[PDB]
Each structure stands twice: as structure tokens, then as C-alpha cells.
Design a protein around this motif. Structure first.
Motif, PDB file in Angstrom:
ATOM      1  N   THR A   3      -2.116  13.991   3.723  1.00  0.00           N
ATOM      2  CA  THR A   3      -2.003  12.983   2.675  1.00  0.00           C
ATOM      3  C   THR A   3      -2.685  11.686   3.108  1.00  0.00           C
ATOM      4  O   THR A   3      -3.814  11.406   2.706  1.00  0.00           O
ATOM      5  CB  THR A   3      -0.530  12.729   2.340  1.00  0.00           C
ATOM      6  N   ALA A   4      -1.994  10.901   3.929  1.00  0.00           N
ATOM      7  CA  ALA A   4      -2.537   9.638   4.418  1.00  0.00           C
ATOM      8  C   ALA A   4      -2.679   9.642   5.940  1.00  0.00           C
ATOM      9  O   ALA A   4      -3.261   8.724   6.518  1.00  0.00           O
ATOM     10  CB  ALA A   4      -1.655   8.480   3.974  1.00  0.00           C
ATOM     11  N   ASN A   6      -0.999   8.695   8.046  1.00  0.00           N
ATOM     12  CA  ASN A   6      -0.537   7.406   8.571  1.00  0.00           C
ATOM     13  C   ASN A   6      -1.586   6.766   9.482  1.00  0.00           C
ATOM     14  O   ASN A   6      -1.381   6.650  10.690  1.00  0.00           O
ATOM     15  CB  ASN A   6       0.780   7.584   9.332  1.00  0.00           C
ATOM     16  N   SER A  36      10.599   3.528   5.921  1.00  0.00           N
ATOM     17  CA  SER A  36       9.950   2.898   4.777  1.00  0.00           C
ATOM     18  C   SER A  36       8.474   2.658   5.067  1.00  0.00           C
ATOM     19  O   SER A  36       7.621   2.810   4.193  1.00  0.00           O
ATOM     20  CB  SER A  36      10.636   1.573   4.438  1.00  0.00           C
ATOM     21  N   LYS A  38       6.548   4.317   7.493  1.00  0.00           N
ATOM     22  CA  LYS A  38       5.834   5.578   7.643  1.00  0.00           C
ATOM     23  C   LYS A  38       5.471   6.163   6.282  1.00  0.00           C
ATOM     24  O   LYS A  38       4.294   6.368   5.986  1.00  0.00           O
ATOM     25  CB  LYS A  38       6.682   6.579   8.426  1.00  0.00           C
ATOM     26  N   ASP A  39       6.478   6.458   5.462  1.00  0.00           N
ATOM     27  CA  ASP A  39       6.234   7.050   4.150  1.00  0.00           C
ATOM     28  C   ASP A  39       5.248   6.221   3.330  1.00  0.00           C
ATOM     29  O   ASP A  39       4.604   6.738   2.417  1.00  0.00           O
ATOM     30  CB  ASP A  39       7.551   7.194   3.385  1.00  0.00           C
ATOM     31  N   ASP A  40       5.130   4.939   3.656  1.00  0.00           N
ATOM     32  CA  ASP A  40       4.216   4.057   2.940  1.00  0.00           C
ATOM     33  C   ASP A  40       3.429   3.176   3.913  1.00  0.00           C
ATOM     34  O   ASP A  40       3.933   2.155   4.383  1.00  0.00           O
ATOM     35  CB  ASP A  40       4.992   3.188   1.952  1.00  0.00           C
ATOM     36  N   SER A  42       0.698   1.471   3.240  1.00  0.00           N
ATOM     37  CA  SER A  42       0.261   0.273   2.533  1.00  0.00           C
ATOM     38  C   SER A  42       1.356  -0.788   2.556  1.00  0.00           C
ATOM     39  O   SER A  42       1.130  -1.938   2.178  1.00  0.00           O
ATOM     40  CB  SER A  42      -0.108   0.615   1.088  1.00  0.00           C
ATOM     41  N   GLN A  43       2.546  -0.390   2.998  1.00  0.00           N
ATOM     42  CA  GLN A  43       3.682  -1.294   3.069  1.00  0.00           C
ATOM     43  C   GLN A  43       3.809  -1.938   4.450  1.00  0.00           C
ATOM     44  O   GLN A  43       4.635  -2.826   4.648  1.00  0.00           O
ATOM     45  CB  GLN A  43       4.961  -0.536   2.728  1.00  0.00           C
ATOM     46  N   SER A  44       2.991  -1.487   5.404  1.00  0.00           N
ATOM     47  CA  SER A  44       3.022  -2.033   6.765  1.00  0.00           C
ATOM     48  C   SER A  44       3.147  -3.557   6.769  1.00  0.00           C
ATOM     49  O   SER A  44       3.721  -4.136   7.690  1.00  0.00           O
ATOM     50  CB  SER A  44       1.769  -1.612   7.532  1.00  0.00           C
TER      51      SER A  44
END
Length: 62
Positions: A3-4, A6, A36, A38-40, A42-44
Motif C-alpha cells: 500500500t504505502a 510506510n 495512528s 503507522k496506519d497513516d 501522511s499524519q506523521s
């Protein structure tokens, strides 16, 4: 591949350690920040910042 993957490069990966370390933050809070984060990826920014300021105020020492 997945997917991404990470893509937490050297700049983004720093968030993880600083998150896991957060010497003065509820490590349970740290963990939550990892999930929160890892799953996202872009939220880093939202997680790293929230954990940064939170740890500062919530930090015991003073």
C-alpha cells in the motif's frame, strides 16, 4: 507491493523514535501515536507534533 510501505524516510522515521522515546510522555500514549502514525504516514506531522507538545506539557519534571 502492499500500500504505502510506510515510507518513513530518515526525516519521517525520526518521528517514530521520538514517538517511542518521548521521555516524559505516557508510553501508552506513545504506542497510540505509533498506531495512528503507522496506519497513516501522511499524519506523521499531526502525530509527531501532537506528541511533541503533549510530552512537553504533560512532562513530569519541571
Amino acid at each position: 507491493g502492499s500500500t504505502a510501505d510506510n515510507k518513513f524516510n530518515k526525516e519521517q522515521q525520526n518521528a517514530f523514535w521520538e514517538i517511542l522515546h518521548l521521555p516524559n510522555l505516557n508510553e501508552e500514549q506513545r504506542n497510540g501515536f505509533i498506531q495512528s502514525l503507522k496506519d497513516d504516514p501522511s499524519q506523521s506531522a499531526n502525530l509527531l507534533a501532537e506528541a511533541k507538545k503533549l510530552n512537553d506539557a504533560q512532562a513530569p519534571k519541571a
